Amino acid sequence: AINIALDGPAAAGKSTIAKRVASELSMIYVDTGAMYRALTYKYLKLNKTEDFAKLVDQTTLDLTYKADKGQCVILDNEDVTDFLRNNDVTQHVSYVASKEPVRSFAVKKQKELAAEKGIVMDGRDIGTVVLPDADLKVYMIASVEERAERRYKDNQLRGIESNFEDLKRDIEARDQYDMNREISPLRKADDAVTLDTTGKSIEEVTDEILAMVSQI
């Protein structure tokens, strides 16, 4: 029974890696970003309301998992899993995630999900705020250019055309906003281990994290 915190900037690979690791350790992967994006989706639907307390009050949000253990986001009884990226949500999520009522709502749900351990949770404030007692806290990093290029490649693959410069600029802007916001900004926990993903296979990084897991 262990919990693994995986924090890092945008397009750092986190979700990918978190899936593999969870798989190999027969654990469940929780993508917290999906939660903030779902709430941002609701925000857009509500004409970008500034009343986040009310938004959260009048919203139900559950994370569920399929056969392949893939995470599904159920917002107000609708599966919005496939509408949280490569669209306007990405451009507004940092702003919405900076709001107190939003973070309080999401964090409480995230802790409930990890109460019985067995969770590999990725995000920005997992090792610092959500799972301060996680058995392993990893802080994934890579250069903006590295991350931009990897996102670009992925996109071209997935059948999504994207402009490299825009991708890099948006990634930089999101990371900057997330690192400077007043509440639970993205930052390395004192007991976290830095892990550079640059020039490393999706497998290599998974192996490294597993290596650390075996030590505890």
Ligand X SMILES: Nc1ccn([C@@H]2O[C@H](COP(=O)(O)O)[C@@H](O)[C@H]2O)c(=O)n1
Tell me, what amino acid is at 170? D
In angstroms, the CA 88 to CA 86 distance is 7
CB nearer to ligand X: pick between 36 and 214 = 36
Binding residue (CB under 6 A) for ligand X from 93, 113, 120, 142: 93
Query: How far apart are CB 125 and ligand X at their closest, in Å?
Result: 5
73 binds ligand X (CB under 6 A): no
Contact 15, 109 (CB under 8 A): no
Contacts of 44-48 with CB under 8 Å at 24 or more apart are 44/88, 44/89, 44/92, 48/92
Query: In angstroms, rounded to a whole number, what is the distance separating the alpha carbons of residues 78 and 180?
Result: 32
**Residues 6 or more apart from 10 whose CB is under 8 A from it?**
147, 171, 174, 175, 178
Q: Is 32 in the site for ligand X (CB under 6 A)?
A: yes
Q: How far is the CB of 214 from ligand X (least distance, A)?
A: 26
> Which H or E run contains 40?
helix 32-45
Please tell me the number of Cα atoms within 13 Å of 91 on its side-chain side.
6
Nearer Cβ to ligand X (4/93): 93
- For the bound state, the minimum distance from the C-beta of residue 183 to ligand X, rounded and expressed in Å, comes to 9
Binds ligand X (CB under 6 A): choice among 105, 123, 150, 151: 123
- Does position 97 bind ligand X by CB under 6 A? yes
101 near ligand X, judged by CB under 6 A: no
- Decide if residue 99 touches ligand X (CB under 6 A): no
Minimal distance in Å, beta carbon 10 to ligand X?
5
170 binds ligand X (CB under 6 A): no
- Give the binding site for ligand X (CB under 6 A): 10, 32-33, 36-37, 93-94, 97, 123-126, 174, 178
